[PDB]
Write a protein that binds this DNA or RNA. Structure first.
Length: 906
DNA sequence: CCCGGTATGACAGCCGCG
DNA sequence: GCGGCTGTCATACC
């Protein structure tokens, strides 16, 4: 076993490191690390060190890290570049671990915990920590145990001890339904007072100090609450004891709304799962509370209880504790499915960074470029300050709002990373500039060729073709690595398939499985030794073949995330290799790419269909184009197809046989026109959309930029058994839209695309008739409660007050002086309903906390004074009118067709 | 620097307008 | 009384 690191930190003139040694023991080092930095020198001085520009550099070795840091300030005050890695933690990791890090997760202590705090005051602020911590569930990955800390006596109640017997029983039997998987894994311990509890938790923390600390909201609630609580009761010295190095910093996170404070525990990587999920799930969710996320991933959700949580410990302490245990297990179950922690570790050691820096695409890329440059004796440039200067971004085509019967879409692969390599874009690779014509003229190939010598972007930039760019080289690596690991994953998957044939007829023998590598396909000699092998050994080979497939999967997605990271880094002023001209070179070339191929697809389809001057490309967004296939179908005639699958086959082949070669030679023309280093503009066919054959459906429609619906039969080569609706930007996709209305609008769209006008009309009529019979929760809008106090003037709405906020202030006057009634909290989501003019409430609308019924001492009047008309018009009819206008359909039978004209009268 | 550019929509408030 | 704006706020997605 080769040693790896756990956490690294700099305190004064010392690196403090937690690390696993060659024997597997967790250990700590204090090293008085001697960093190196670099300055420019004359050609006379003989060094092996050069910068990315090739200019010679002399190596300066400092006695400590403070001298290094003071030297950087002195070089700034002189006006000369101070070259090298200024984040000395990264240099230490590079020096101490100059090899491919192979870690062993079972020796990494990964803790996830959750806290409970009874509070009749409202949400207990972590910075003040006014109320007693009355429960802690702390899971440890090494022990595989849930350590549960339980407070029996607090100012808010004296309670019985928790029962594991009851907690395991069925929910109908009065039990908490804690899974038998974790029942034999709970270490329960009750306490007579909070001080005893908090002090035991601290001693527990010292013996089992987390390397990775996770959980839901741990960074913004749990950790701050435990720290501040211990601090307020025992003093700051005791609270620092939560850090292995007894050093803590109070960070102030100032978001563009308010300001909150997080606590930095030196020697611990905090990877909050709420942040970890938002970063790596790539699924946009309405709510990000553990409850919603659990039921989404695990189909079980968080544990239910009766009454307000502020009254739970009193009324049902048995539930309260079991709710705390399950809260921790919910996160562990999610991580068992998604494995974002293992992912985070994988990338942390690949980049050689602090694990919590996986949230930073800047840190990660800074280190990956640093390490590969280090092994070539090359010196990284100094990070220079840059003014935040907004530059052009992605091109988006304004579509003509219409229906579109048949649609076929195509995507460029890894567009921005592809341009970087194609054009060879890097700081040191800038070769000069050319007099730039309008983009229009480069799209139409009317402008003169920018350079015979250098590779070019349509923004005026020129780059060397002979040199290998530092950025281009570094991302080509990542590409090649991903292919390599996805070449091992496909091999490990296919190698397991041959094993599954042997799982039907084996023969027992006392032998261990053969030493073979699953990353590469088996030879004939290994294939000969399959039937003879035993049943015990065959299941061991299947275990290790699948184990190899899991290792390949993790690697191939980690590199995928890096590919998509780079542009972000490159376009960020804080990044070392950032250059504004290089950034606009990427986006502008991309703008040219999509519009040039729009031209080429139009010119090809016109020539083939015989027509001239017809817009086939109906829409385009960044790296994708959408083609109208009507003419292609009408060229064969849709009456010649026997079924839906017949014309989907037709279009699929057409794209591959006719369209894709026309695109490739189209882009090959563009590469030669810009004189680029290599052609890397590749376009895959994604979606084939259209209405079912012999149906009155319209297939798809656009209402504007980023607002469309499509009936998709085939995506990226896989044929769907049943048609699947792709909806983007429309109200069905917005969490502000009421539950029943989100459902109704989707069906309205389904009926439009699959069935036609009359069906939509029959549905609308019925939904209008039955709207008043729907539940008041399902038909209410949801909104975010930001800036409540700002627009509040003595309990009434002020100038420029938003609609939902007005609703909140109406609710507040209705429950003014009522503690049992739910309070609307700044930040949290709210239900909104309109009220008929003349109601006993203040205004025209009421808003109450989301996910809850209204207080019974106000419910009747709300339900009585609801404005259904306004609600149906605002949330349902208006957005539908939106879709139907573009689609050129009617939702109501006799609508005057003169309504679609912007008449005079002016 | 632990994601903001390119987007649309709901609503408030203003301006002309016999 | 209502388009035609501008401004604030809310929420999509790569």
């Amino acid at each position: 076993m080769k040693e790896f690191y756990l956490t690294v930190e700099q305190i004064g003139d010392s690196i403090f490191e937690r690390y696993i040694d060659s024997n597997g023991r967790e250990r700590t080092r204090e090293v008085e690390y001697k960093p190196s930095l670099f300055a420019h020198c004359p050609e006379s001085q003989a060094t092996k060190y050069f910068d990315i520009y090739g200019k010679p550099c002399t190596r300066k070795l400092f006695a400590n890290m403070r001298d290094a840091s003071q030297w950087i300030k002195r070089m700034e005050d002189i006006g000369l570049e101070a070259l090298g890695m200024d984040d000395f933690k990264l240099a230490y990791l590079s020096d101490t671990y100059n090899y491919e890090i192979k870690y062993d997760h079972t020796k990494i202590r990964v803790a996830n915990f959750d806290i409970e705090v009874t509070s009749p005051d409202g949400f207990p602020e972590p910075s003040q920590a006014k109320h007693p911590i009355d429960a802690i569930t702390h899971y440890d990955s090494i022990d595989d145990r849930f350590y549960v800390f339980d407070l029996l006596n607090s100012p808010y109640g004296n309670v019985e001890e928790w029962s594991i017997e009851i907690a395991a029983k069925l929910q109908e039997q009065g039990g908490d339904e804690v899974p038998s998987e974790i029942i034999d894994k709970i270490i329960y311990m009750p306490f007579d007072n909070e001080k005893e509890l908090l002090m035991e938790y601290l001693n527990f923390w010292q013996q089992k100090t987390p390397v990775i600390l996770t959980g839901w909201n741990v960074e913004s609630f749990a950790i701050p609450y435990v720290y501040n609580r211990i601090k307020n009761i025992f003093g700051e010295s005791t609270a620092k004891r939560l850090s292995p190095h007894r050093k803590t910093r109070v960070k102030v996170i100032e978001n563009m709304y308010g300001s909150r404070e997080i606590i930095t525990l030196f020697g611990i990587s905090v990877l909050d799962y709420i942040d970890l999920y938002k970063k790596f799930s790539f699924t946009n969710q309405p709510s990000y509370s553990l409850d919603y996320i659990s039921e989404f991933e695990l189909n079980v959700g968080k544990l239910k209880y009766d009454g307000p949580i502020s009254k739970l410990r009193e009324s049902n302490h048995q539930r309260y504790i079991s709710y705390n245990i399950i809260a921790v297990y919910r996160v562990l179950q999610i991580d068992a499915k998604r494995q974002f922690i293992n992912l985070s570790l994988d990338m942390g050691y690949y980049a050689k960074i602090q694990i919590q820096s996986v949230f930073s695409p800047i840190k990660t890329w800074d280190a990956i470029i640093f390490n590969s440059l280090k092994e070539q004796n090359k010196v990284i440039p100094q990070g220079r300050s840059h003014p935040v200067q907004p530059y052009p971004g992605a091109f988006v085509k304004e579509p003509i709002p219409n229906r579109y019967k048949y649609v076929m879409s195509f995507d460029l692969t890894s567009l921005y990373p592809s341009i970087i390599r194609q054009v060879n874009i890097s700081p040191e690779t800038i070769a000069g500039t050319f007099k730039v014509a309008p983009l229009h003229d480069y799209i139409n190939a009317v402008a003169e060729r920018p350079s015979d010598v250098y590779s070019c972007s349509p923004n005026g930039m020129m780059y060397y073709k002979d040199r290998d760019g530092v950025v281009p080289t570094e991302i080509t690596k990542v590409f090649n690595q991903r292919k390599e690991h996805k070449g091992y994953m496909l091999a490990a998957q296919r190698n397991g398939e041959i094993i599954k044939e042997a799982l039907h007829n084996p023969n027992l023998s006392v032998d261990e499985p053969l030493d073979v590598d699953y990353r590469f396909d088996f030879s004939d000699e290994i294939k000969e030794k399959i039937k003879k092998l035993s049943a015990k050994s065959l299941n061991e080979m299947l275990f290790r073949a699948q184990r190899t497939e899991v290792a390949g999967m993790t690697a191939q997605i980690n590199r995928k995330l890096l590919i998509n990271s780079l542009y972000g880094a490159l376009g960020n002023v804080w990044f070392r290799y950032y250059d504004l001209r290089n950034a606009t070179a990427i986006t502008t070339f991309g703008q040219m790419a999509l519009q040039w191929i729009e031209r080429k697809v139009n010119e090809y389809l016109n020539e083939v269909c015989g027509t001239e001057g017809e817009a086939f490309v109906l829409y385009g967004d960044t790296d994708s184009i959408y083609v109208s296939a009507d003419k292609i179908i009408d060229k064969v005639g849709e009456s010649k197809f026997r079924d839906t699958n017949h014309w989907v086959d037709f279009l699929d082949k057409f794209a591959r046989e006719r369209m894709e070669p026309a695109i490739d030679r189209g882009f090959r023309e563009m590469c030669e026109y810009m004189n680029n280093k290599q052609h890397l503009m590749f376009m895959d066919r994604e979606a084939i959309a259209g209405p079912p054959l012999g149906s009155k459906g319209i297939g798809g429609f656009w209402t504007g930029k980023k607002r469309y619906a499509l009936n998709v039969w085939d995506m990226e080569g896989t044929r769907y058994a049943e048609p699947k609706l792709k909806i983007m930007g429309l109200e069905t996709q917005k969490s502000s839209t009421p539950k029943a209305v989100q459902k109704a609008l989707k069906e309205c769209i389904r009926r439009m695309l699959q069935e036609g006008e009359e069906s939509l009309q029959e549905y609308f009529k019925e939904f209008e008739k039955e709207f008043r019979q729907l539940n008041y929760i399902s038909i209410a809008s949801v909104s975010s409660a930001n800036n409540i106090a700002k627009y509040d003037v003595g309990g009434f709405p002020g100038p420029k007050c938003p609609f939902h906020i007005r609703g909140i202030l109406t609710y507040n006057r209705a429950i003014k002086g009522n503690i049992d009634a739910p309070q609307v909290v700044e930040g949290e989501k709210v239900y909104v309903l309109p009220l008929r003019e003349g109601n006993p409430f203040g205004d025209k609308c009421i808003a109450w906390p989301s996910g809850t019924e209204i207080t019974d001492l106000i419910k009747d009047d709300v339900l009585h004074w609801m404005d259904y008309t306004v609600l149906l018009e605002k949330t349902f009819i208006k957005p539908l009118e939106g879709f139907t206008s573009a689609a050129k359909l009617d939702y109501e039978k006799k609508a005057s067709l003169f309504d679609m004209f912007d008449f005079h009268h002016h």
